[PDB]
Design a protein around this ligand. Structure first.
Ligand code: ATP
Ligand code: CL
Ligand code: CL
Ligand code: K
Ligand code: K
Ligand code: K
Ligand code: MG
Length: 378
């Protein structure tokens, strides 16, 4: 092709390409190495990635995300029925299959989850093409290890619709392991633990690798735990702060809340590198500017329980895998949330000081591995 590797995440997608023995994680038109898994529909256009997320606050009903949560599932699924209650966009039943319903150019339209995902994949494909200066056709697309045959099929279909020849659908933890060369043959089998904390889901996977062959020993986690939840904690904290400082509640102003959330998400990323972050919002509510800051210590306290809770699925995974902590040869960090220092501390302490594989940006590790595998399969 060269063939590319694409990580189609619930919240962000990432694309990489293996060239000259090196993986290049490709930045998009805005210079971002990951792109929001968002698609928006308006009176005049269809927006994807950054363009879509940048307007979610003003067009909540027609801005779609979380397609990964619906992909390959049935409308009558308990989780689909539960998820629908929290999404601002509509989900309808088409002969037992879920479809997102939106308004586009003044008309009601509906798209299958794979159609929405194909739009995101198209964006990733174009991002790669802009970088390579060549047409990209072949690709390896990743999925969570617990995905079933239908969810994998629908994911492959999204690729095909986007014009990609999906060489293979591989598990996210396996892709992460490959990124670190943990698939190389060293004689005996090795047990690897993948700790994946993304924007919306937490996945712990224990893999056993031997002769380049992977075996998913066990999986654990929480499909509703991620960076988004950490943002929510900060949002509530600041809503309370604004109320104290202005005797005004912004909670019911959907937009004001979203703008605060975006500011919180950005502050959070900064706290992974510095011990303090500033938040300065203009015209947050009724023309009132909100200039404040938050410390890393404060951020950690607001999320203490959630952070500490990530260890439970780790213990469960080990138990189900019938392995003690000491039997894990490597710990791989995946997902943007694992960049949080407190999370790294908790996991390392749990593993009695064992070092964490974290040299590859956690939110890029999956695409990195997928790119390596795509090259191999080309
Ligand atoms: N430096 C950072 N510190 C803390 N959190 C970060 C940092 N960079 C990114 N994040 C968070 O990482 C999350 C996105 O992670 P990732 O890119 O792995 O998502 P994803 O694969 O779509 O995840 P999932 O499928 O779980 O939603 C967001 O919540 C984002 O705020
Ligand atoms: Cl772009
Ligand atoms: Cl601690
Ligand atoms: K991702
Ligand atoms: K995840
Ligand atoms: K997941
Ligand atoms: Mg992910």
């Amino acid at each position: 092709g060269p063939a590319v590797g694409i990580d189609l995440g619930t919240t962000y997608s990432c694309v990489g390409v293996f060239q000259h023995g090196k993986v290049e994680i490709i930045a998009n038109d805005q210079g971002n190495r990951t792109t929001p898994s968002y698609v928006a529909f308006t009176d005049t256009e269809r927006l994807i990635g950054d363009a879509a997320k940048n307007q979610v606050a003003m067009n909540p009903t027609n801005t779609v995300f979380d397609a990964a949560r619906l992909i390959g599932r049935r409308f009558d699924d308990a989780v689909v029925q539960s998820d629908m209650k929290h999404w601002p966009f509509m989900v309808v039943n088409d002969a037992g299959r879920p479809k997102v319903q939106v308004e586009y150019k003044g008309e009601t339209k509906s798209f299958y989850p794979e159609e929405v995902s194909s739009m995101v994949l198209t964006k990733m494909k174009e991002i790669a093409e802009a970088y390579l200066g060549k047409t990209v056709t072949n690709a390896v697309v990743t999925v969570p290890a617990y995905f079933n045959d239908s969810q994998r099929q629908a994911t492959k279909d999204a690729g095909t619709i986007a014009g990609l020849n999906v060489l293979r659908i591989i598990n996210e933890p396996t892709a992460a392991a490959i990124a670190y060369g943990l698939d190389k043959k060293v004689g005996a089998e090795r047990n690897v633990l993948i700790f994946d904390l993304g924007g919306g889901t937490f996945d712990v996977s224990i893999l056993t690798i031997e002769d380049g062959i992977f075996e998913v020993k066990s999986t654990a986690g929480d499909t509703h735990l991620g960076g988004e939840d950490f943002d929510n904690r900060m949002v509530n904290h600041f809503i309370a702060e604004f109320k104290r400082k202005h005797k005004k509640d912004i909670s019911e102003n959907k937009r004001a809340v979203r703008r605060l959330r975006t500011a919180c998400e950005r502050a959070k990323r900064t706290l992974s590198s510095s011990t303090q972050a500033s938040i300065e919002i203009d015209s947050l509510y009724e023309g009132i500017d909100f200039y404040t800051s938050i410390t890393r210590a404060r951020f950690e306290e607001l999320n203490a329980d959630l952070f500490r809770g990530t260890l439970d699925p780790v213990e469960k995974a080990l138990r189900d895998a019938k392995l003690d902590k000491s039997q894990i040869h490597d710990i791989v960090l995946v997902g943007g949330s694992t960049r949080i220092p407190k999370i790294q501390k908790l996991l390392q302490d749990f593993f009695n000081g064992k070092e964490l594989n974290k040299s590859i940006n956690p939110d890029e590790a999956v695409a990195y591995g997928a790119a390596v595998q795509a090259a191999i399969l080309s």
